[PDB]
Amino acid sequence: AVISVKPILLAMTPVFILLCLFFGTRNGFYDTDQYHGNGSAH
Amino acid sequence: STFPWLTTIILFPIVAALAIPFIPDPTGKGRPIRWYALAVGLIDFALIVYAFTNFYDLNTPGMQLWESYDWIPEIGLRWSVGADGLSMPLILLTGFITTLAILAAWPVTLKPRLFYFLMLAMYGGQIAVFAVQDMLVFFLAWELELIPVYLLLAIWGGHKRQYAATKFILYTAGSSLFILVAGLAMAFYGDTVSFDMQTLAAKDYALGFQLLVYAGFLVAYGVKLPIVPLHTWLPDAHGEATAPVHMLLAGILLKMGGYALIRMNVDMLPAAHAKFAPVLVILGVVNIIYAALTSYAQRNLKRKIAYSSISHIGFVLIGIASFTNLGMSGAVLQMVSHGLIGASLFFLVGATYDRTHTLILEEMGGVGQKMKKIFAMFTACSLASLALPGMSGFVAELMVFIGFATSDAYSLPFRVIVVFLAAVGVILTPIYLLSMLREIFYGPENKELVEHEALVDAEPREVFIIACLLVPIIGIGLYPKLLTQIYDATTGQVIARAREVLPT
Amino acid sequence: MEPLYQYAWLIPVLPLLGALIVGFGLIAFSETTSKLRRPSAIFIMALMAIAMGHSLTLFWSQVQGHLPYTQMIEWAAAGNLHIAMGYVIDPLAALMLVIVTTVAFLVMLYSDGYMAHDPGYVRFFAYLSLFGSSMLGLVVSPNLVQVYIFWELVGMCSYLLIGFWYDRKSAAEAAQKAFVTNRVGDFGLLLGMVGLFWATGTFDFAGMGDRLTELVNTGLLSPSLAAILAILVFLGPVAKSAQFPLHVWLPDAMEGPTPISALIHAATMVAAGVFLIARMFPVFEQLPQVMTTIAWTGAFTAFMGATIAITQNDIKKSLAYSTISQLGYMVMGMGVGAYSAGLFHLMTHAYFKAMLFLGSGSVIHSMEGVVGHNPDLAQDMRYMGGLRKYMPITGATFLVGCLAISGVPPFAGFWSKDEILGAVFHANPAMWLLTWLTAGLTAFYMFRMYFMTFEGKFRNVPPERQEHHDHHSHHAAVPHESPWTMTLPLVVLAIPSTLIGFVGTPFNNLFEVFIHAPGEEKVAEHAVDLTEFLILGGSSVGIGLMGITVAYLMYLKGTPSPQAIAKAIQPLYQFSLHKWYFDELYEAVFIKGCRRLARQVLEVDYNVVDGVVNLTGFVTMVTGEGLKYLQNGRAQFYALIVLLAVLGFVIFSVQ
Amino acid sequence: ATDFNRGIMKFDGADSPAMIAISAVLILGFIAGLIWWALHTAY
């Protein structure tokens, strides 16, 4: 009796994909203040 | 199983990064280019899971995505790919981190057509390191992430970028040549001129010949995986980098020097491994004690955890050079654990620098009063690097200690001193990680707040990248057989190929 | 039994989900969950009360005569190297199950009173259930691996809770010290856990004692070499129970919240630091040199932390110095062998230090009324004397907490305290008369804290005269500030103190020891008599009784002044006032030394091994700037090198 | 060492070049002393 990785990775993969596409749309501070500007670490 | 899977997964982000100069609508910064790189990074990671959950067929020693295409019959190099147990976790780890490294590369608006080209070229070029069963394609893929990671530091980096970028490209191209030197020395040994990693492992080499090849590979792999004499390239290029570039640097590129130590220095060179295994566990402990003190002695924030990446690497060398089925199981686990722990830590350093713009850590203090979700995630990510149980940073180091001092390879006066000295890093890692948390967030004494650090917030996307990185951190910490079942049968053949060598 | 014992793993994982849910609700929904402060408290408190319902019938099933029940699930397997992690339901473990979850449900009742003025109300109940879920797994642990998953886990919750407020610079440095000093104990525990898996070969406590005694008499292990294994495992509990080398973090652990101080002295100090050595008596009983080491470092801590509690004005810091000594008073009972009584001074410590700690916070929330928010020591500004003259029910509940820790005639301590005093005057009474000397001193500093702050006048006139706070004038002087959520937990934690008026009596002292059997059935004792037990008790009650009459007369003169003591014993008074001069030894040597050793590892990195790298790039740049001067125009010179190399190659190649 | 000596707990006072070489021979000698230990004490 071993919990196998394949059924829980295949079940968490479409949860992982559609949340990356959703959480990109919802974001803050990188569009309004944004005093870092173009150079991302200058 | 007839479809080219690992050939596609390697070659998909390379051929799709060529469509990045042809992406329309350049309305200001590159917003559709940013969404295009996430769209291809997500569907390429889904190809890794589709090749895993349908065609990996675990507890089977050997490659199960083995596709040996002919490229140049005159030299003898083939396009031979394949994922065994030493490759498939790191192939799955590369597809997972780089997908978030595109998501971490959202505030970059400097040269967005150039950024997501080189990051996708690293996405095809890092899977290509663990997957190929060859030498001249392995040296190709090792130096495939030589130009696009140079330009990721030299354009989007801190200050002293040009010192950090040119020191790095001279230190790794000047050390990848020993993969060509030792890879050609092994293939021309004897009579068969094969270059695949299968036949070159089964070939019998002399003991004096293998000590030159082992010394050549240790110069080549002691640079990327930072063994502490050849480590000075790291905290400059890791100290001057952005958050998404750093998740590929410490998350994946450091593990290619640890993947090839188990693959090209233990499988192919077992008799030279046994003669020079006690120098690795000495170099592995002094990887920990040197870097954890240097993390405490440094006050630059991005440079502190950059040295902490060298200390968690130090437990891999004790795991490889222990000849134990549990010791080597803790070495591959430390490569997957620190890749998830570091890419979560180094994402939050670029998140903290995006609000405070200092990294000096003297003008900081009381940041946790202003932003709260960043400090709540900076604590839990630094706690995973404390080797705290319930997280994968502990069981990766627990298997190394148990795997070392149960092995019938070293003597008893040697095994006690190494385990006692490698456990000093158990004390030393809460010294600087908690002092970094204290001298940034804990306290009332804030900054000037009028010239520097005028803004403070916490984006909900930055919460998601941390929270999805802590699921394989905690989920391996509550069940370490979730990753061990990928390489339980392959590590059992790597160690047993060296168990036949140890009476020597 | 079968749905009660096979689902016994629900007791750790139920309060874990209380923090998993609201932790996911604070990191993503912080606008609503911070407003949802009152319902999320009762939601977390419900799943602790459900886990209280498990342990109250799992332990009650054990005292009726049920067998111990084990379970093991594989954790991390390899070639011939397995890790197993499950649980056991032991009468020792089931007694520890009730102790940790009664005082966790009780401190959640207390938590509604000390705050709901604090905006960190929701996060406090998240961290409280994270403490319990990490500690309810430590007590059910069958293995040395399984005690180590939750050894550093409760050290994490001890780190997160001491630095709960995180806006003080004092609580900033306090939380970091508590993790490091516990990690040195975790450094010793991890060394011995691998070291005992090396020798024996299994991680369970039952399979470790029989394997250690199999090799120490055969000749495989040495009696001197295998002795160093058990002291390393013992170095774990010397950090969590605050023994002699590692006790510095306890004066600073009082910089956190007052309800946490009751839980870091009932759940991770007297519970955790005593349970691990209690489970390892299969190992320690076969090694005599280890047990005299444990008893010696317990005997000094009963004297070390005792003297620092006197001339300590702070109420929380004086209780922290007491539980240094009372733990040392208890760990030395496990050093002399008589450890069943060491586990029955466990029940009267957790329910009475929490009586003293939670009772102290009712004084602290009262002291915010007339006095400002900064001082909480022995009272100034209407100075020390009277709080119980205002007649609160919070005043009489730490007096009975102080009454049962001295050894007084009409209450507890007459039945509980002096049982390990007769067992310690057997073997080495010269080095262990020191505990009898401080036995009147534990009666000193506890009653020194009673009538200095509760008997006199503490409402007349302010000496400092600076509060000026609207949150201090609304802090409800005349000590009824303590709301209805202090009426219950300051009383219902004493309904076992009435039960110890019935259990642990001269007909129930015997019937409890038969429950707490050792690894074998044997009970070792030197000599107990019928006639000698009265003078060993009747003279041991008097030293505790005269230890408070020298305090009843000292601190009711106004000033602590018998003759030639105002001009004090400054050779010794400078030790206790400046806190043993032990914090500055650890600071000027170890902290500065690790700031000095580490610095020259950075400068040998940046200059020596980085100088070789910046010299390979320097002797190549100045090489190309030396052969740049090889060409200089003047094409006659270019024809010279062509004609010289012709003359070179005709001598070089003819031989 | 001017940037290494910020206004926090560092700058102990031994950052001289006479101390850099004498810290090198102890640190690099301990690694080499453990390496030469390793090829003989192990087996």
Side-chain angles (χ1 to χ4, degrees), chain B residues 317-338:
Chain B
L317 280 306
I318 308 167
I320 307 180
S322 44
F323 308 95
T324 307
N325 216 325
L326 197 53
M328 193 66 92
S329 188
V332 195
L333 182 48
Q334 189 51 76
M335 297 193 301
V336 179
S337 176
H338 165 248

PDB file of all heavy atoms in Angstrom, chain B residues 317-338:
ATOM      1  N   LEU B 317      26.903  16.453  -1.757  1.00  0.00           N
ATOM      2  CA  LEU B 317      28.200  15.790  -1.885  1.00  0.00           C
ATOM      3  C   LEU B 317      28.371  14.691  -0.846  1.00  0.00           C
ATOM      4  O   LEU B 317      29.035  13.682  -1.102  1.00  0.00           O
ATOM      5  CB  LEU B 317      29.341  16.795  -1.736  1.00  0.00           C
ATOM      6  CG  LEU B 317      29.802  17.720  -2.864  1.00  0.00           C
ATOM      7  CD1 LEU B 317      30.133  16.930  -4.126  1.00  0.00           C
ATOM      8  CD2 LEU B 317      28.817  18.845  -3.125  1.00  0.00           C
ATOM      9  N   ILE B 318      27.773  14.873   0.331  1.00  0.00           N
ATOM     10  CA  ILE B 318      27.792  13.832   1.347  1.00  0.00           C
ATOM     11  C   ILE B 318      26.851  12.699   0.950  1.00  0.00           C
ATOM     12  O   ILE B 318      27.081  11.536   1.299  1.00  0.00           O
ATOM     13  CB  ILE B 318      27.431  14.455   2.705  1.00  0.00           C
ATOM     14  CG1 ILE B 318      28.328  15.660   2.967  1.00  0.00           C
ATOM     15  CG2 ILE B 318      27.638  13.472   3.839  1.00  0.00           C
ATOM     16  CD1 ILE B 318      27.855  16.524   4.099  1.00  0.00           C
ATOM     17  N   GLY B 319      25.808  13.009   0.179  1.00  0.00           N
ATOM     18  CA  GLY B 319      24.884  11.972  -0.245  1.00  0.00           C
ATOM     19  C   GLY B 319      25.412  11.142  -1.400  1.00  0.00           C
ATOM     20  O   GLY B 319      25.175   9.933  -1.463  1.00  0.00           O
ATOM     21  N   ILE B 320      26.125  11.775  -2.336  1.00  0.00           N
ATOM     22  CA  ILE B 320      26.692  11.042  -3.465  1.00  0.00           C
ATOM     23  C   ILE B 320      27.844  10.159  -3.009  1.00  0.00           C
ATOM     24  O   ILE B 320      27.903   8.968  -3.339  1.00  0.00           O
ATOM     25  CB  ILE B 320      27.135  12.008  -4.579  1.00  0.00           C
ATOM     26  CG1 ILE B 320      26.000  12.954  -4.970  1.00  0.00           C
ATOM     27  CG2 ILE B 320      27.607  11.237  -5.789  1.00  0.00           C
ATOM     28  CD1 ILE B 320      26.368  13.928  -6.066  1.00  0.00           C
ATOM     29  N   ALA B 321      28.771  10.715  -2.238  1.00  0.00           N
ATOM     30  CA  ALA B 321      29.959   9.971  -1.824  1.00  0.00           C
ATOM     31  C   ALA B 321      29.744   9.242  -0.501  1.00  0.00           C
ATOM     32  O   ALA B 321      30.545   9.347   0.425  1.00  0.00           O
ATOM     33  CB  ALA B 321      31.154  10.911  -1.745  1.00  0.00           C
ATOM     34  N   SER B 322      28.660   8.472  -0.410  1.00  0.00           N
ATOM     35  CA  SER B 322      28.393   7.657   0.766  1.00  0.00           C
ATOM     36  C   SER B 322      28.085   6.206   0.445  1.00  0.00           C
ATOM     37  O   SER B 322      28.097   5.386   1.370  1.00  0.00           O
ATOM     38  CB  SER B 322      27.227   8.240   1.577  1.00  0.00           C
ATOM     39  OG  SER B 322      26.162   8.630   0.731  1.00  0.00           O
ATOM     40  N   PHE B 323      27.804   5.873  -0.823  1.00  0.00           N
ATOM     41  CA  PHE B 323      27.571   4.506  -1.310  1.00  0.00           C
ATOM     42  C   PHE B 323      26.409   3.824  -0.594  1.00  0.00           C
ATOM     43  O   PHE B 323      26.479   2.639  -0.261  1.00  0.00           O
ATOM     44  CB  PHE B 323      28.833   3.642  -1.210  1.00  0.00           C
ATOM     45  CG  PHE B 323      30.040   4.256  -1.850  1.00  0.00           C
ATOM     46  CD1 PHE B 323      30.945   4.983  -1.093  1.00  0.00           C
ATOM     47  CD2 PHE B 323      30.278   4.092  -3.204  1.00  0.00           C
ATOM     48  CE1 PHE B 323      32.060   5.541  -1.676  1.00  0.00           C
ATOM     49  CE2 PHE B 323      31.394   4.649  -3.793  1.00  0.00           C
ATOM     50  CZ  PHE B 323      32.285   5.377  -3.029  1.00  0.00           C
ATOM     51  N   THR B 324      25.336   4.565  -0.350  1.00  0.00           N
ATOM     52  CA  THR B 324      24.186   4.053   0.376  1.00  0.00           C
ATOM     53  C   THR B 324      22.941   4.292  -0.464  1.00  0.00           C
ATOM     54  O   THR B 324      22.817   5.331  -1.115  1.00  0.00           O
ATOM     55  CB  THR B 324      24.064   4.741   1.743  1.00  0.00           C
ATOM     56  OG1 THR B 324      25.312   4.637   2.436  1.00  0.00           O
ATOM     57  CG2 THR B 324      22.994   4.085   2.608  1.00  0.00           C
ATOM     58  N   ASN B 325      22.030   3.314  -0.462  1.00  0.00           N
ATOM     59  CA  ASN B 325      20.758   3.472  -1.153  1.00  0.00           C
ATOM     60  C   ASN B 325      19.882   4.545  -0.518  1.00  0.00           C
ATOM     61  O   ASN B 325      19.031   5.116  -1.205  1.00  0.00           O
ATOM     62  CB  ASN B 325      20.014   2.137  -1.187  1.00  0.00           C
ATOM     63  CG  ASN B 325      19.234   1.934  -2.469  1.00  0.00           C
ATOM     64  OD1 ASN B 325      18.696   2.881  -3.039  1.00  0.00           O
ATOM     65  ND2 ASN B 325      19.174   0.693  -2.934  1.00  0.00           N
ATOM     66  N   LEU B 326      20.070   4.830   0.772  1.00  0.00           N
ATOM     67  CA  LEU B 326      19.397   5.947   1.420  1.00  0.00           C
ATOM     68  C   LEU B 326      20.211   7.232   1.370  1.00  0.00           C
ATOM     69  O   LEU B 326      19.627   8.322   1.394  1.00  0.00           O
ATOM     70  CB  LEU B 326      19.081   5.598   2.877  1.00  0.00           C
ATOM     71  CG  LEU B 326      18.047   6.455   3.610  1.00  0.00           C
ATOM     72  CD1 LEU B 326      16.751   6.530   2.822  1.00  0.00           C
ATOM     73  CD2 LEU B 326      17.799   5.916   5.009  1.00  0.00           C
ATOM     74  N   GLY B 327      21.539   7.134   1.294  1.00  0.00           N
ATOM     75  CA  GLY B 327      22.352   8.333   1.178  1.00  0.00           C
ATOM     76  C   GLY B 327      22.220   8.985  -0.185  1.00  0.00           C
ATOM     77  O   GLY B 327      22.078  10.207  -0.292  1.00  0.00           O
ATOM     78  N   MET B 328      22.259   8.176  -1.246  1.00  0.00           N
ATOM     79  CA  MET B 328      22.053   8.697  -2.592  1.00  0.00           C
ATOM     80  C   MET B 328      20.609   9.121  -2.812  1.00  0.00           C
ATOM     81  O   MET B 328      20.343  10.015  -3.622  1.00  0.00           O
ATOM     82  CB  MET B 328      22.466   7.646  -3.621  1.00  0.00           C
ATOM     83  CG  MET B 328      22.604   8.158  -5.045  1.00  0.00           C
ATOM     84  SD  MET B 328      23.953   9.329  -5.241  1.00  0.00           S
ATOM     85  CE  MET B 328      25.287   8.231  -5.707  1.00  0.00           C
ATOM     86  N   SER B 329      19.665   8.506  -2.095  1.00  0.00           N
ATOM     87  CA  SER B 329      18.280   8.956  -2.149  1.00  0.00           C
ATOM     88  C   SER B 329      18.098  10.320  -1.502  1.00  0.00           C
ATOM     89  O   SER B 329      17.174  11.047  -1.874  1.00  0.00           O
ATOM     90  CB  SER B 329      17.364   7.940  -1.469  1.00  0.00           C
ATOM     91  OG  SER B 329      16.002   8.264  -1.679  1.00  0.00           O
ATOM     92  N   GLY B 330      18.951  10.678  -0.545  1.00  0.00           N
ATOM     93  CA  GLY B 330      18.945  12.009   0.021  1.00  0.00           C
ATOM     94  C   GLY B 330      19.688  13.044  -0.784  1.00  0.00           C
ATOM     95  O   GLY B 330      19.492  14.242  -0.572  1.00  0.00           O
ATOM     96  N   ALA B 331      20.542  12.610  -1.709  1.00  0.00           N
ATOM     97  CA  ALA B 331      21.243  13.527  -2.596  1.00  0.00           C
ATOM     98  C   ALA B 331      20.352  14.021  -3.726  1.00  0.00           C
ATOM     99  O   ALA B 331      20.366  15.213  -4.048  1.00  0.00           O
ATOM    100  CB  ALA B 331      22.490  12.854  -3.173  1.00  0.00           C
ATOM    101  N   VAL B 332      19.577  13.122  -4.339  1.00  0.00           N
ATOM    102  CA  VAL B 332      18.637  13.531  -5.379  1.00  0.00           C
ATOM    103  C   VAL B 332      17.480  14.306  -4.767  1.00  0.00           C
ATOM    104  O   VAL B 332      16.920  15.214  -5.392  1.00  0.00           O
ATOM    105  CB  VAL B 332      18.147  12.302  -6.166  1.00  0.00           C
ATOM    106  CG1 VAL B 332      17.464  12.724  -7.459  1.00  0.00           C
ATOM    107  CG2 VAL B 332      19.305  11.374  -6.464  1.00  0.00           C
ATOM    108  N   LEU B 333      17.107  13.963  -3.533  1.00  0.00           N
ATOM    109  CA  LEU B 333      16.075  14.706  -2.824  1.00  0.00           C
ATOM    110  C   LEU B 333      16.528  16.114  -2.460  1.00  0.00           C
ATOM    111  O   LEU B 333      15.705  17.033  -2.476  1.00  0.00           O
ATOM    112  CB  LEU B 333      15.660  13.943  -1.566  1.00  0.00           C
ATOM    113  CG  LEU B 333      14.545  14.491  -0.675  1.00  0.00           C
ATOM    114  CD1 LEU B 333      13.332  14.891  -1.478  1.00  0.00           C
ATOM    115  CD2 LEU B 333      14.171  13.460   0.365  1.00  0.00           C
ATOM    116  N   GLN B 334      17.813  16.306  -2.161  1.00  0.00           N
ATOM    117  CA  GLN B 334      18.307  17.639  -1.830  1.00  0.00           C
ATOM    118  C   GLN B 334      18.359  18.532  -3.064  1.00  0.00           C
ATOM    119  O   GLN B 334      18.231  19.756  -2.958  1.00  0.00           O
ATOM    120  CB  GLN B 334      19.685  17.529  -1.172  1.00  0.00           C
ATOM    121  CG  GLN B 334      20.237  18.820  -0.579  1.00  0.00           C
ATOM    122  CD  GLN B 334      19.266  19.512   0.353  1.00  0.00           C
ATOM    123  OE1 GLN B 334      19.074  19.091   1.491  1.00  0.00           O
ATOM    124  NE2 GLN B 334      18.656  20.590  -0.123  1.00  0.00           N
ATOM    125  N   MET B 335      18.523  17.935  -4.246  1.00  0.00           N
ATOM    126  CA  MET B 335      18.515  18.720  -5.474  1.00  0.00           C
ATOM    127  C   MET B 335      17.110  19.198  -5.813  1.00  0.00           C
ATOM    128  O   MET B 335      16.930  20.303  -6.335  1.00  0.00           O
ATOM    129  CB  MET B 335      19.097  17.901  -6.624  1.00  0.00           C
ATOM    130  CG  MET B 335      20.550  17.527  -6.434  1.00  0.00           C
ATOM    131  SD  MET B 335      21.296  16.892  -7.941  1.00  0.00           S
ATOM    132  CE  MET B 335      20.242  15.485  -8.274  1.00  0.00           C
ATOM    133  N   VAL B 336      16.098  18.384  -5.519  1.00  0.00           N
ATOM    134  CA  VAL B 336      14.730  18.789  -5.814  1.00  0.00           C
ATOM    135  C   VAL B 336      14.210  19.723  -4.727  1.00  0.00           C
ATOM    136  O   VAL B 336      13.486  20.684  -5.012  1.00  0.00           O
ATOM    137  CB  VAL B 336      13.846  17.542  -5.988  1.00  0.00           C
ATOM    138  CG1 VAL B 336      12.398  17.913  -6.273  1.00  0.00           C
ATOM    139  CG2 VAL B 336      14.397  16.667  -7.098  1.00  0.00           C
ATOM    140  N   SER B 337      14.609  19.484  -3.473  1.00  0.00           N
ATOM    141  CA  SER B 337      14.147  20.314  -2.363  1.00  0.00           C
ATOM    142  C   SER B 337      14.711  21.724  -2.422  1.00  0.00           C
ATOM    143  O   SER B 337      13.956  22.690  -2.284  1.00  0.00           O
ATOM    144  CB  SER B 337      14.524  19.677  -1.029  1.00  0.00           C
ATOM    145  OG  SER B 337      14.167  20.524   0.048  1.00  0.00           O
ATOM    146  N   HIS B 338      16.024  21.862  -2.626  1.00  0.00           N
ATOM    147  CA  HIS B 338      16.635  23.185  -2.661  1.00  0.00           C
ATOM    148  C   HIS B 338      16.231  23.955  -3.914  1.00  0.00           C
ATOM    149  O   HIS B 338      16.177  25.190  -3.891  1.00  0.00           O
ATOM    150  CB  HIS B 338      18.157  23.057  -2.557  1.00  0.00           C
ATOM    151  CG  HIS B 338      18.898  24.300  -2.931  1.00  0.00           C
ATOM    152  ND1 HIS B 338      19.690  24.384  -4.054  1.00  0.00           N
ATOM    153  CD2 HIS B 338      18.937  25.521  -2.349  1.00  0.00           C
ATOM    154  CE1 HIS B 338      20.202  25.599  -4.140  1.00  0.00           C
ATOM    155  NE2 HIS B 338      19.758  26.309  -3.117  1.00  0.00           N
TER     156      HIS B 338
END
